[PDB]
Amino acid sequence: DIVMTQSPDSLAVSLGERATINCKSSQSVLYSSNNKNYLAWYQQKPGQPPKLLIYWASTRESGVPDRFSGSGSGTDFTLTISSLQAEDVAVYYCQQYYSTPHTFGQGTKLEIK
Amino acid sequence: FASVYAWNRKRISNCVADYSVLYNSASFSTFKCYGVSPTKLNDLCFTNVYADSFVIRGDEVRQIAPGQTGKIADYNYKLPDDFTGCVIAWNSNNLDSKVGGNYNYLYRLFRKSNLKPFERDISTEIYQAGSTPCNGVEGFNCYFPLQSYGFQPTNGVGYQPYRVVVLSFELLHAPATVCGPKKSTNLVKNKCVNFNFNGLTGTGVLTESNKKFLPFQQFGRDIADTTDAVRDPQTLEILDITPCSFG
Amino acid sequence: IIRGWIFGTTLDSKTQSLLIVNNATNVVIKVCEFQFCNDPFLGVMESEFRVYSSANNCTFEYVSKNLREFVFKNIDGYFKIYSKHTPINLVRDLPQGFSALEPLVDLPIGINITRFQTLLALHRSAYYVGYLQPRTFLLKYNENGTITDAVDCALDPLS
Amino acid sequence: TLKESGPTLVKPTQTLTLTCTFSGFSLSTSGVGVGWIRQPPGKALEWLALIYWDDDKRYSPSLKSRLTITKDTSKNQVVLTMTNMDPVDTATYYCAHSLFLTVGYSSSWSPFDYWGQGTLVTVSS
Ligand SMILES: *[C@@H]1O[C@H](CO)[C@@H](O[C@@H]2O[C@H](CO)[C@@H](O)[C@H](O)[C@H]2NC(C)=O)[C@H](O)[C@H]1NC(C)=O
Ligand SMILES: *[C@@H]1O[C@H](CO)[C@@H](O)[C@H](O)[C@H]1NC(C)=O
Ligand SMILES: *[C@@H]1O[C@H](CO)[C@@H](O)[C@H](O)[C@H]1NC(C)=O
Ligand SMILES: *[C@@H]1O[C@H](CO)[C@@H](O)[C@H](O)[C@H]1NC(C)=O
Ligand SMILES: *[C@@H]1O[C@H](CO)[C@@H](O)[C@H](O)[C@H]1NC(C)=O
């Protein structure tokens, strides 16, 4: 089991600003037969499901702003959201199929400063 | 063009190859020569030239080289470690990429073992990652082995399709084969010149004659075995050769 | 009736061979790996060519009474062919006389050769084989440049 | 484009079909599936069931006894029946569309890619 520990909880990031969320997998989740990380970042809007933002941790989903972009290495996995807009009051998740049970990020409060 | 997992293979043969029209065409984004620097190609002769053709991403052109690794060079197309030919590559975004995604260009992403150089593998068996047998159906640790580039015209460079041609000059042990062009010039008569007809090399003054060779005969010689006539290989006329005055 | 020869070391697959054929159209030189009938021939409807059953890996192609002599030799990856067509005033016996053979072809193949055969057009509706050795000859040249007579210098003391 | 239709308030112990009505794709070609999810409030999520293209069914081993899925490529749906209701199963019940399990080292099955919305379930008499 590889637990996914988030980065910034009650994030008081200002508007249009770089909001950062790290994800620390407890083990190196890299399937080395890809030369490419996998990780799926998610956005629970309150009262709404989490929706897939970036798969492969570098290949952003369709219709998503590229102001969000994924990063990370080995066990440390960051998220390069360059700008925090007013639409970004949401809850966020990071996970890995490279395990056995339903590992999870825990979810972060996005206060917009 | 042809896929990357089933590349083509044309065996160029006895011909007159002019690698200069290639080398200077300036339309190629990559022209590397390994066994032999490019300008000396139009001055050498081999037994066979092979030309392999396929289509890859933009930033996988660096795995088409001797001694590399990656999903392409591991199991799609492997170049031996003492390669001799040249590798040519140019961008082809407007031809191969189509709106909505061109899903007809596949590549192999799982194989049991890396390819031998110049080996080819078009099978389509379900790959088996884990220990559990697969029985020809998909599932966890039972994967289809081919994926497809979905090329789209609004892709950043390094994700647009590049077409690649790999020329490989080989020299078995035959008697000869294709080589580069051979110049030529006009012929002046009644002057001491340095002539050269096909390899017949000498100096003297050339006049027109009253001999008649046999259609297969290419030059004449007299007693003491000196060349005293020749046929020139374009007019089909025989010419007398006379040494240039001395005393 | 004589419709070309077939050459090579094994006259089958697993090694390369030459094939020289002539239907009622014209000559067809060819170099692949074949599978040759152990008794290969062509018929005469006029449907034919039970010669081979395989044409793999072809490395050279080409398409397009009487006495017909040929000299075949194979040096440094070149397969040379000399030939001459004289008219006999007999039908099928070897005559006497002198007639020099003029070069026809040159093929830069590389092929190894140890064996050869012949091809014949069947019935549905005479030939000789010499071998060549390293000799020394004395050729007499005409004033037009043709060989009119010769001397084999190892026949007898006079020669 | 998935969407999980179903009743909102339930009563215990009986079997319960569940309908993730989708569109935009079929569900029987090599590399396609849909995984079913729950989440009780405040908890992290819990995937429940899954079925692939030639109907390769997965379930959670805990409620393997009670979960029973089937895909509907024709309706662009999935039917999942599910028995033995209890108040700790007070969850909202999601489906998520699988695609090319070759990518499968990224989510712990919790998500996937597509993902509809969810039919709420509360266990109350
Ligand atoms: C070589 O090519 C040239 C043309 O490139 C041929 O020249 C022609 O020769 C004929 C005589 O047979 C003349 O009537 C023409 O006027 C010539 N044309 C030109 C443009 O020079 C020449 O015959 C060719 N020779 C061989 C052996 O191929
Ligand atoms: C004569 O034989 C050759 C051998 O391949 C063949 O290509 C050619 O077509 C034949 N002639 C005709 C008229 O078919
Ligand atoms: C010759 O043919 C055989 C069988 O068709 C094939 O295995 C082999 O690769 C061919 N030779 C070359 C040089 O490709
Ligand atoms: C022909 O056969 C001989 C067998 O002694 C072999 O050594 C030789 O290499 C062959 N020719 C070529 C060109 O390989
Ligand atoms: C060929 O030789 C004959 C006799 O040697 C001679 O008469 C003739 O002029 C020569 N040239 C020809 C026939 O063009």
Numbering used by the authors:
A (entry chain L): 1 to 113
B (entry chain A): 347 to 593
C (entry chain B): 100 to 143, 153 to 172, 187 to 247, 264 to 297
D (entry chain H): 3 to 127
What does the published report state?
RBD, which directly binds to ACE2 receptor, is a major target for development of the therapeutic nAbs against COVID-19. The prefusion structure of S protein exhibits more dynamic conformational changes in S1 region, especially in RBD, which has two distinctive conformations, “up” and “down”.10,11 Only the “up” conformation of RBD can bind to the ACE2 receptor. To further explore the interactions between nAbs and S proteins, we solved cryo-electron microscopy (cryo-EM) structures of the S protein in complex with ten nAbs, in full-length IgG-form or in both IgG-form and Fab-form. Bivalent binding was revealed for the full-length form nAbs, which showed that the full-length form exhibits different binding mode and induces more RBDs to the “up” conformation than the Fab-form that is monovalent.
